[PDB]
């Protein structure tokens, strides 16, 4: 039944990680971010209300699909000014299907390490051309009608199917940051980065 608590845990995590990525990749100016501590790590978090709302609407809508485990990967895509994908932060997900105490805090211990990898990830990636936008993509496991239904959870925040233009990146080179395993969660974060 744990479907919902892992979804809980992951959503709290992806919010942290998304914010940090927008900061570290400089998709938004230093100045709307405020220093915070999460999983006991120094992080940044926008306090621009609409950006925050945006990121939240997204995670709120994904949540139920995590609960039933239909999401295969969640990907944050940085786009150049021509709307061509420059790089993607790929969170590949598994939820293996029971429990003896403090499992959750061990899981957050492991996620902390992802947050760090993100915060020192300029060391391994080439910087983007300026005027980059970003977007979120949710790759479902199954191509399923049911998926569209459970994702349409806020009117005023619809989802559509992606185009080839949203996903095609020519010649990707791969930069893994972090992998983890546990009884409840298996996840890896790698970056797919455009070649030139």
């Amino acid at each position: 039944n744990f479907g919902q608590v892992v979804a809980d845990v992951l959503c709290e995590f992806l919010e942290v990680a998304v914010h940090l990525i927008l900061y570290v990749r400089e998709v938004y100016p230093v100045g709307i971010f405020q220093k915070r501590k999460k999983y006991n790590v120094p992080v940044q978090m926008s306090c621009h209300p609409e950006l925050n709302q945006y990121i939240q609407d997204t995670l709120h809508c994904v949540k139920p699909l995590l609960e039933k485990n239909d999401v295969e990967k969640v990907v944050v895509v940085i786009l150049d000014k021509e709307h061509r994908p420059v790089e993607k932060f790929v969170f590949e997900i598994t939820q293996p299907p029971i429990s003896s105490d403090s499992l959750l805090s061990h899981v957050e211990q492991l996620l902390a390490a992802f947050i760090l990898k993100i915060s020192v990830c300029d060391a391994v990636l080439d910087h983007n051309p300026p005027g980059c936008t970003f977007t979120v993509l949710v790759h479902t496991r199954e191509a399923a009608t049911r998926n569209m239904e459970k994702i349409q959870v806020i009117k005023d925040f619809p989802w559509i199917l992606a185009d080839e233009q949203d996903v095609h990146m020519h010649d990707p080179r791969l930069i893994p940051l972090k992998t983890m395993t546990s009884d409840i969660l298996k996840m890896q974060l790698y970056v797919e980065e455009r070649a030139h």
Binding site: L174, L177, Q188
Partner: protein
């Protein structure tokens, strides 16, 4: 299952350590068994480990011990990369 001889990253290090430093030999069986270990990390969706191993083997093999270890690394990289290209649609890094 995973293992070169066996398993945890920092034990796979010690084994690669004792191998590349002391040996200085082309045990071709053995290069092969490293390719298999690497491509299995691919299939186990364990890319962080795939990268630490590939990067660590670059450090220890590129420095030298003649050059046998220089073609070896090249050879391992080649096969890892063709497999990555088919299973992730991506080549690795450095």
């Amino acid at each position: 299952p995973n293992l070169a001889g066996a398993v945890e990253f920092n034990d796979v290090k010690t084994l690669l350590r004792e191998w590349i430093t002391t040996i200085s030999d082309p045990m071709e069986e053995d290069i092969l068994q490293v390719v298999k270990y690497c491509t299995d990390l691919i299939e186990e969706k364990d890319l962080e480990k795939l990268d630490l191993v590939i990067k660590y083997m670059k450090r220890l093999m590129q420095q030298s011990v003649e050059s046998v270890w220089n073609m070896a690394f090249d050879f391992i990289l080649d096969n890892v990369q063709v497999v990555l290209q088919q299973t992730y649609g991506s080549t690795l890094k450095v």
